[PDB]
Amino acid sequence: PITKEEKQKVIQEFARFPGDTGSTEVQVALLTLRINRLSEHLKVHKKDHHSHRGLLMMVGQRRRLLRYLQREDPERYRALIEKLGIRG
Amino acid sequence: MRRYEVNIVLNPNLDQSQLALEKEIIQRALENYGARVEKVEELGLRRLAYPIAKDPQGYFLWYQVEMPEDRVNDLARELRIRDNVRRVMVVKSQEPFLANA
Amino acid sequence: KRQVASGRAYIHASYNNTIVTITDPDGNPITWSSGGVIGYKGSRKGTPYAAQLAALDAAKKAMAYGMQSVDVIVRGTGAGREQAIRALQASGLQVKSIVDDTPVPHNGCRPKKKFRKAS
Amino acid sequence: PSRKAKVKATLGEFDLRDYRNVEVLKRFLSETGKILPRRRTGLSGKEQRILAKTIKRARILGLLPFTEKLVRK
RNA sequence: GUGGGAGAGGGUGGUGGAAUUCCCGGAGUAGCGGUGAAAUGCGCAGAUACCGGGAGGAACGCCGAUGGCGAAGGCAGCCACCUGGUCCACCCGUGACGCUGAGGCGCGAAAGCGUGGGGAGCAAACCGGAUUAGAUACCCGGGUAGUCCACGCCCUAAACGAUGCGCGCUAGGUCUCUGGGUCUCCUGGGGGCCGAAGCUAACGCGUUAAGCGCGCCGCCUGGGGAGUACGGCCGCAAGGC
RNA sequence: CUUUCU
Ligand SMILES: [Mg+2]
Ligand SMILES: [Mg+2]
Ligand SMILES: [Mg+2]
Ligand SMILES: [Mg+2]
Ligand SMILES: [Mg+2]
Ligand SMILES: [Mg+2]
Ligand SMILES: [Mg+2]
Ligand SMILES: [Mg+2]
Ligand SMILES: [Mg+2]
Ligand SMILES: [Mg+2]
Ligand SMILES: [Mg+2]
Ligand SMILES: [Mg+2]
Ligand SMILES: [Mg+2]
Ligand SMILES: [Mg+2]
Ligand SMILES: [Mg+2]
C-alpha cells in the first residue's frame, strides 16, 4: 500500500514551511499519490467499480483544491502542477 | 514484510527419513520465498476431527515467518505441491485478543 | 447363513414410508424391510404402524442370521421414525444405542418448489 | 433453554484468537460441530464474532469438527 | 496530519467440509416413489434402503441477531493479495478552499440479448399423470432455454423508508452495534422502540421529523383514453427514455 | 383435494 514513510516522505517534500501538514499543496500532493496508486489498481481490476467511485471522489477533491489555489495564488498553482504532473 | 503463521499438515505415517525429506523441502521452500522463520512449534501427530486424505490422524507443524506480502500465495502455491503435504494455512500474525481475563 | 449377532440397524424415515435395514459391523446389509415390504401400498405405507411392522420384520429376519446386539441409526423424520425404534428396542435384539445421523446440507442444492421458501 | 452456564465462566484468561487451542474451543461447540450461540457461550457480539471466525479455522486445519452425530434420540 | 477501531464494502487467486446427481466395487431383494387419494415414473439388465471409492456443478449450515457494511442496486465458509468508504481521539496543519446541481459521465436486482464455455440441483416452455362439469391451472412424474463463468449489450423494478441533499435549532426514556473516557455513568458515530413541544385529513411522524427554519435540484395539477399515438434519441433484439 | 354463479 502506502507506507507511512511513503506518505510522510511526500509531506515533507511539499510543506510550505517546517511542519506543514494541511497546506493546499501538501494535500494535492497526497491525492495525486493516492489517486495514482488506485489509478493503477484499476488498470487491472476493471470490474472493481465500488473502488472506482472512491477514485471519482479523489479526482473531485483534488480539482476543487487546485481550483482554489489557481484562484488564490495563481503562482503556487502553476508551480504545483508542473512540480507534480497534472494536466496531460 | 509482514509476520504470518504457516500451519502445515502432512502424512502421519512418514518415517523419520521420509519425514525429514519433506521438512527439508519446506524449509527450503520458505527460504525460496523470503520466508524468514521467526519461530517453530512442531506439535507432532494429532487426532483429527474428521479424517483427511483417508488418514484418521495428522502430523502438524507451525512456523511464524516474516516475508513479502507480494508473495505469500506463491509460497503456499508452492507448499501444497508436495504430496505428503495435505493441509496448509498461512494465517496472518494477530495480536492475541483475550477474553474472560 | 452367516451368524453376526453384533450388527447395526438403519431406520430411514420419511413422511411417505419408513424402511429399516439391518447390517453387519462393516456396514454391509444383511436383511432389509419397508412398509411396502409387508402389504401396505401407497398411503398406509408410511404410518407409524406400518413402521412398527417393518421394524419387527427387519429384526425377525435378521434373527435368522443370528443377530442380537444392534446400534440403531435414524435418518429423516416422519410419522413412524420414533415408532419403529420402539419396535426394534423390543423385538428381541439388544438395542445398544441410537443415533440420529439424518443428512443435512450446509446449503447446497436448491430444493424443489415443494420445499423452497427461505429467502 | 440455555439455562445451564456461560461457557466463558467455566474458563480462564484465554485468547479467543488462538485457533489451535482445541481443548478450549471444543467448549463452544454443541453436541455437533455446531458453534454455540451467545445465549450459551456468553460473549460480546465482538468476542463471539471472533470465536466463530477462529473455530472455522480449526475446522479447516482439522482440529475441530464441522458436525457430529447426535446420540440418544 | 498523527495515532487508533469495526465491518457479508469492491476486485483477484486459491482453498474447506456438508448435501444432491452420476459413475465404480461391495453387500442385499422386491419394491421404491409420489398424493387428499392416486397414477405417471423408476426397479429382477437387481432399483430403494446400507458401506467404500471416484467424478462434477452449484450453494455456503451452526455462528446469525431483534446484527454489520455500502450511494444505490446489493454484500454473508475460509485464506492471502489488491482496493473504496467510514468513525473516534489529539487540536497539530491550510484558511471559507463551502452547499446544491439543469445537461454530461459512471453504477445499476431479476428477467432478457450476442459469442464462447459450463451444466450437479432447479426449472418458464414443453411431455405426461391426476383433479375438474371443463383444467390450456393449482397437485404428481419428466424436462429445454435459463439459472453458473467470461467478454460485450440491456437500464428496468413495490429500484420502498412508497419519505431528494446539506446545515442550524426544538424534552426525555429504553435497547443495541462500534470508538474514546475520570469506564455502575459520561461522551462521539450508527441501528431500533416509546414519547415533550410541535405537525398531520386521519393513520402517524417526533434530535434516525413527517417539527421549527434557510439553500439548491426533481416532481404534481380530477378519472378513463394512456405510459398509448406521433416525432425524436438510445438498443442486436426484446424494448427503454 | 378442485369445489361456479345470482
Ligand atoms: Mg489549531
Ligand atoms: Mg495563519
Ligand atoms: Mg442490470
Ligand atoms: Mg442475469
Ligand atoms: Mg447468454
Ligand atoms: Mg398437467
Ligand atoms: Mg413440474
Ligand atoms: Mg425435476
Ligand atoms: Mg434514542
Ligand atoms: Mg442515536
Ligand atoms: Mg402532543
Ligand atoms: Mg414515535
Ligand atoms: Mg384526462
Ligand atoms: Mg435499430
Ligand atoms: Mg355470471
Give the three cell numbers for residue B88: 496448509
Distance of CA C14 to CAs A73, C19, C41, C80, C89, Å? 83, 9, 15, 8, 20
* Dihedral (CA of B68, B74, B76, B82) sign: negative
Q: Where are the domains of chain A?
A: 1-88
Q: How far is it, in rounded angstroms, from Cα C119 to Cα B53?
A: 36
Interface test with chain D among C75, C96, C99, C106, by most D beta carbons within 10 Å: C99
Query: Which nucleotide is the nearest neighbour of A23, by CA and C1'?
Result: E94
CB B38 within 8 A of CB B9: no
Residues of chain D neighbouring B52 (CB-CB closer than 8 A): 62
Q: Which chains does A contact via 3+ CB–CB distances below 8 A?
A: none
Q: How far is it, in rounded angstroms, from Cα C11 to Cα C76?
A: 8
Place of cell 495435505: B86
- Domains within chain C, CATH numbers bracketed: 1-119 (3.30.420.80)
CB C70 within 8 A of CB C95: yes
Whether residue B53 lies within 8 A of chain D, CB to CB, comes out as: no
Q: How far is it, in rounded angstroms, from Cα D16 to Cα D64?
A: 15
CATH class of domain segment(s) A1-88 = mainly alpha
Query: Which nucleotide is the nearest neighbour of A8, by CA and C1'?
Result: E1
Q: How far is it, in rounded angstroms, from Cα B14 to Cα C105?
A: 35
Q: Kind of pairing, strands B2-10 and B55-67?
A: antiparallel
DSSP letter at D35? B
CB B63 within 8 A of CB B98: no
Give the three cell numbers for residue C36: 411396502
CB A76 within 8 A of CB A23: no
Which residues is chain A interrupted after (C–N above 2.5 Å)? none
This structure's resolution (Å) is 3.3
CATH class of domain segment(s) B1-101 = alpha beta
Run of H or E residues at A44? helix A24-44
Give the three cell numbers for residue C5: 449377532
- Domains within chain D, CATH numbers bracketed: 1-73 (4.10.640.10)
Q: Which chains does D contact via 3+ CB–CB distances below 8 A?
A: B, C
CB B93 within 8 A of CB B65: no
CB C80 within 8 A of CB C14: no
Residue B56 has phi, psi (to 5 degrees) of -75, 10
